[PDB]
Amino acid sequence: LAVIKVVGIGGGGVNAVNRMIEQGLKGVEFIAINTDAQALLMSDADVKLDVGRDSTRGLGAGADPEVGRKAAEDAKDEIEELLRGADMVFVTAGEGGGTGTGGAPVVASIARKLGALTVGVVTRPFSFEGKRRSNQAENGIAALRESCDTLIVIPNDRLLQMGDAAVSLMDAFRSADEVLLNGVQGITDLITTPGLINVDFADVKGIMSGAGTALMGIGSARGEGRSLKAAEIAINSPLLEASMEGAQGVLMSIAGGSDLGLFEINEAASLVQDAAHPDANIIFGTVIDDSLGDEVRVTVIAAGF
Ligand SMILES: Nc1nc2c(ncn2[C@@H]2O[C@H](COP(=O)(O)OP(=O)(O)O)[C@@H](O)[C@H]2O)c(=O)[nH]1
C-alpha cells in the first residue's frame, strides 16, 4: 500500500488541492504550501505550511519567482519532514506566479532525493494574463522539469476551447482546478482504487521515472458505446497535442462503476494501443468509482519526447 502525497504550492495549487478534496480524491495526503496566512485559512488540506514573510503585514501580492524560491529553501527541513517516507509525491501549481513558480522546483528536488517518484502537475497561464506571467511560467516550467521524474504541463488556453463561450474570469480558474485534479486522480486512482484490470505502483513507476516532459488528455461518455467514445475524446483532447504518437510511454486509466464491462475495457485498450507509436510502452488499468453512475472517464498521460 503506497504513501502518496499531493502538494499544492502557491495560490492556484492550493485552490486546486481544495477541488481535489471537495471532489473526494482518496488514498492521498494533501499538503498546502503558501506564503499568505489568509489564503491558507480557506484551505481544507490535512497539512498546511506558511512560508516566507507574514502575509498579515507587508507585500503578499507581488508575484516574484525569486521570492517564492528563497521562501521554499528556508523551509527545506520542514518540507522534507512533511514528505518523509512517501512513495509518490505530486507537486501541483499554477505556473506564472511567485510562490508556485519558484517554490515548486525546490519541493520536487526534495521529494526526489527522498527517493519518491516525483510528478509535477502544473498549468501554463492564460494568454490574457499577459506576457510577464507567460515568461515567468516558462522559466518555472524549465526549472521544475529538472526536479521532477515527470512533468505534466496543461496549457490553460486550451481549456477555453472546451469550456463554454460565455464563462466568467472565475469559472476559467475553476476549470483549471478541475483539470489539475483530473491529472492527479487519473494516475493515483489506478493505485488506490483499482478495478478488474489491476495496475500496481511498480508499473506506474516504470513508465514515469525519468520520463521528462509529459501531456494529458481526458474524455467521458454515457451508455451507448461509452468507453470507446470516452477514449476517443481523451486521445484527441486539445490538452494533448497532435503529439500522442510521439510518446515514448503512455499511461491510461478508465474509471467507471463496478459493472464496467470487460468488452468495453477492451475497446478502450485497443484504441490506445493503435493510437500510440508502435514502440511506445503502454500501461493501462481500470478504476472503480461508484460516484460516476453510468458515465465512464478515460485519462491518457503521454510522456517522453
Ligand atoms: N487552478 C487554479 N489556477 C489558478 C487560480 N488562480 C490563478 N491561477 C493560475 O496560477 C498562476 C499563478 O497564480 P498564483 O498561484 O495564485 O500565484 P502564486 O501563489 O504566487 O504562485 C496564475 O497566473 C494563474 O494562471 C485558481 O484559482 N486555480
Side-chain angles (χ1 to χ4, degrees):
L1 196 77
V3 180
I4 313 157
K5 290 164 188 184
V6 183
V7 174
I9 187 165
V14 171
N15 294 311
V17 166
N18 272 43
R19 180 56 127 102
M20 297 169 184
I21 293 157
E22 202 254 295
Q23 290 305 294
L25 177 61
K26 297 161 193 175
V28 290
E29 174 174 14
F30 299 104
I31 300 160
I33 298 173
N34 217 339
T35 63
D36 174 281
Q38 301 290 121
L40 277 171
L41 266 274
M42 314 174 313
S43 176
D44 299 305
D46 300 301
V47 176
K48 306 174 192 183
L49 179 68
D50 198 316
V51 82
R53 283 109 78 253
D54 273 12
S55 62
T56 170
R57 57 151 191 155
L59 192 136
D64 188 9
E66 197 45 51
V67 167
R69 189 198 68 88
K70 274 185 173 186
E73 277 164 327
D74 293 3
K76 70 172 176 182
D77 293 344
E78 297 193 59
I79 290 165
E80 195 186 325
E81 272 306 305
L82 298 179
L83 305 176
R84 183 62 66 198
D87 302 297
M88 199 169 188
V89 173
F90 284 89
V91 188
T92 60
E95 286 287 342
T99 312
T101 312
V106 181
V107 175
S109 264
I110 298 160
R112 209 185 187 177
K113 280 163 192 170
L114 276 155
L117 176 68
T118 312
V119 177
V121 188
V122 298
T123 58
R124 276 203 164 89
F126 295 94
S127 287
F128 69 66
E129 303 186 57
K131 184 144 205 184
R132 188 191 147 203
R133 279 185 177 275
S134 190
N135 282 322
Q136 284 179 179
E138 216 44 60
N139 296 305
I141 285 162
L144 179 61
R145 216 192 61 82
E146 216 69 40
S147 307
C148 284
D149 276 301
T150 319
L151 175 58
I152 302 161
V153 184
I154 302 165
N156 272 331
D157 282 353
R158 313 285 195 159
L159 278 164
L160 285 181
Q161 294 149 218
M162 291 157 56
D164 292 287
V167 281
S168 73
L169 196 51
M170 210 155 194
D171 290 337
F173 292 114
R174 279 178 225 164
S175 293
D177 291 328
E178 170 73 350
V179 80
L180 286 173
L181 155 67
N182 294 331
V184 181
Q185 184 174 30
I187 299 169
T188 72
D189 267 28
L190 280 172
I191 300 158
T192 69
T193 165
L196 258 173
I197 286 76
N198 184 357
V199 178
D200 60 42
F201 177 82
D203 303 305
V204 179
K205 180 162 193 166
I207 211 157
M208 306 213 81
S209 291
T213 178
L215 290 158
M216 73 157 298
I218 37 140
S220 33
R222 285 174 171 278
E224 178 67 3
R226 54 182 192 193
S227 295
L228 214 164
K229 262 155 198 160
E232 213 167 303
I233 295 160
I235 63 159
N236 289 292
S237 182
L239 309 166
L240 211 49
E241 318 305 8
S243 43
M244 161 71 169
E245 304 145 62
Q248 285 166 179
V250 171
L251 180 71
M252 202 222 79
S253 70
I254 167 164
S258 309
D259 55 357
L260 180 61
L262 190 56
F263 169 68
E264 288 189 297
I265 296 160
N266 201 38
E267 293 224 291
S270 186
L271 220 195
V272 175
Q273 276 167 44
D274 300 337
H277 189 84
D279 294 2
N281 310 256
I282 305 164
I283 281 149
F284 113 104
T286 55
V287 168
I288 316 170
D289 192 5
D290 298 310
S291 73
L292 281 167
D294 64 307
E295 194 195 42
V296 296
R297 71 169 190 275
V298 173
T299 304
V300 179
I301 318 289
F305 301 95

